[model samples]
Target: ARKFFVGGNWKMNGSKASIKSLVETLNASKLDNKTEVVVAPPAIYLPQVRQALRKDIQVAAQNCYTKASGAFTGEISPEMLKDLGIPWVILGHSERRHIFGESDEFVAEKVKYALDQGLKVIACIGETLEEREAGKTMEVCARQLKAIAKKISESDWSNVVIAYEPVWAIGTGKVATPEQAQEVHAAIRKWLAENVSAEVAESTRIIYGGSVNGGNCAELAKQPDIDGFLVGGASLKPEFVDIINARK
Candidate 1:
């Protein structure tokens, strides 16, 4: 069965003091054991976050380097994160692709390298408003997935969770209605079934991430193909508990 997974992408936000409070709240919150929870804090706070989190709540890095090690400055390698016992990493977030200038090729390379280092990945793929308006949402997402598929074996897909975050909706307060989100998710599943295998398509979690919040998460979570979420702004607030419990 595809496990229900919810992720909180802390992004470039948080201070030590604030993180302490957040973790305290999580520690006290009643989360579903049937569901998997992963949180990504800033690189500097990963160790502290991991240390404070419950064993069942895994920690993730927002981004990681494709190479194991090098002279690259301001980049964290998958090897380094794996060594530190971080089991997950989010690759190809819309911010990274658009703001940070990451290409599909670069994101795919990172996915391959992360899998090689034994790190599970939340590989994100999505289209912008223009692409959606132009009816290219499915096409754009397929191309993104194609890049990653080229580098990894079918079996390697077991460690990956796909997050479909519409670029224009992320952090924009414009949430996609349940129907709109499901349409794209169903398309993604069909793409996976054709390009990969039925096993991969059914077993891998395809989550929604754009503008996900406590108020709207439950409706979106009900979508069959949307296994969970990669929450942004709401992840830092107490409402994150609500998003995690959306399925209930």
Candidate 2:
């Protein structure tokens, strides 16, 4: 029931010259039109990235503040994103949760606020290596998801795309095996079916994000539950086009 959605998070890495070339590559690629594609560059470059890129491939903010306008220094707001025409925002990313110490409730607040402001959200949730070692993967995912689910109404789910980003595998060059990822992906869909509605559970796309590259994406994509990917380092290169075509 869900559509395939592939997103690339070019986390904190780009320059005007390099970004120009990267966008050039994307604009010229023969990407599969069926998959939903969105790429996020740093906030500083979002406007540049958005305008020069093809509209078929959308742009997203890596993160954003809850308020429309604020005295919060070094922050971007959803209002600004709306004004800029950037339609998506990634929230509760693992780096925001672990390295920056964002609590589950805090992440949910961002998710709710972003959705309320009319921006679609790529809401991230996952377990750390320590949590996984303790066999608490689903437990951690549930706690984080519940926080966001509590704040948003049943209808608000339509604007959400859940990303199951396992912290241990992200950027580590070690990836979750297809079966391992499918296990968590299916578990998350089941949780949504039980906690939310069957419609929401079936329709909402659940993507995987870790050490996903061109090599393993096709295998992972065949899994019943892995709707797409939220790729990192690979997203910065031309290979991203290959990953985007995984379904074919």
Candidate 3:
């Protein structure tokens, strides 16, 4: 069976004290045992978050570098994260693309490095408001995936979760319509099927992000190609649990 997967991107928010409480709340909540739950706390909080989290909940890094170790001051390497037992890392987030200037090729490198070190990846890809307006959402997503396709094998995708977060929707209180989200998700799956393999496309979990919340999660979850979500702002609130149970 294809397992349901949900991820929380804490981003640049939360303090140690507040995060401890958040973790405690999640631990007390009733989560679906069959669902895979992962949270991407900021890199600096990796150790604390991982230690405080329940065994069933996995911790992920917000970002990582391609190299094992080098003089890339302020950059965290995949080797470093693996050594600390952080099993997952998010790459190619919209913020990383638009705000921090991460190119698709750079994200692909990080994906390769993270995989080489046996880390799971939440590889994000999506279109901006302008691109969607221009009817280039599929083309934009494909361009991003093309950069990574050359860097990894079809089987390697087993450890990756694709997060489709439209840039304009992230933190804007706006969300892609269920139909809009599924269209891109279905396209990504098709890309995997044609460019990689049918097995990879069928098995890989493609989740939606960008303003996903308790109110709209149920409809989004029902999409055939959408397996779950990469929650942002809502992740820090009690509603996150509601989103987790949306599939039910």
Candidate 4:
């Protein structure tokens, strides 16, 4: 069975003091040992958060560049993240795609490079409000995955986790209902089976995101295809602990 994975994307929020308190709250919470938890803080606070958080709860970089080192000013490289002991990375997030204008090919490049550098990846894919309204959610997701599939070897998928984050829902206080989330997740699994390998489809953990909170998490967690979550605004609060234990 694919193990349940929960990731807290702190995004561009949080102060040093706030992060310290968040770490302390997590440290004191009774998180399920069976659940894999990782938190992605802003790159600036990666080192501090990594040091402050408990060892059992791993740390991830919010994003990384495709190159190991380069003249690309203000970009953190996969090699640097690996060298600093950051085990996971949140890539291709909607914010990266929409706000920063990262093309699918560019995101795939980073995915391939990060896997080569031994970094686990939470690769995000999703449809915008308009795309969903136009009944093109799967089409958009497939287009996103096709780029990554072309760049990554099938074996490299073992180091990857998929996060389906609908752009309209993210930070808009909207959430895909459990049914809506499951439908896409199931389609993603089927896509993996046909495009990658059946083994990969079975093993991959496809998590849901977009305004996931403790109130709605438990129901979402019960969905067969919904393995876990990629939380945003709620990740910074105490309710995050409840969301982590949704499966329990």
Q: Against the true structure, candidate 2 has what lDDT?
A: 0.92
Off by over 4 Å in 2: 171-174
lDDT of 2 by residue, 21-138 (tens): 9999999999998999999999999989998999999899999887888799998889899899999999999999888988988888888899989999999999887788899999
Candidate 3 C-alpha lDDT tens digits along 1-248: 57889899999998999899899999899987878989988888888888888989898999999888879999998888888999999999998888999999999998988998999999999988788889888889899998988898887898999999888676566666999888889999999999899999999999998678899999998999999999998998878888888888
- lDDT, model 2, position 121: 97
What is each predicted model's overall lDDT from 0 to 1?
A: 0.92, 0.92, 0.89, 0.92
Per-residue alpha-carbon lDDT of candidate 1 for residues 129-216, written as tens digits (9 for 90 to 100): 8787798998899999999999999999999999999885655556578888899899999999999999999899999887788889
lDDT of 4 at 114: 95
Reference-based TM-score of each model: 0.97, 0.98, 0.97, 0.98
* Model 2 weakest lDDT span, ten residues long: 167-176
Tell me the RMSD of model 4 versus the true structure: 1.0
**Whose lDDT is higher: candidate 1's or candidate 4's?**
4
**Candidate 4 lDDT, 28-56, residue by residue in tens:** 99998889999999999998988888999
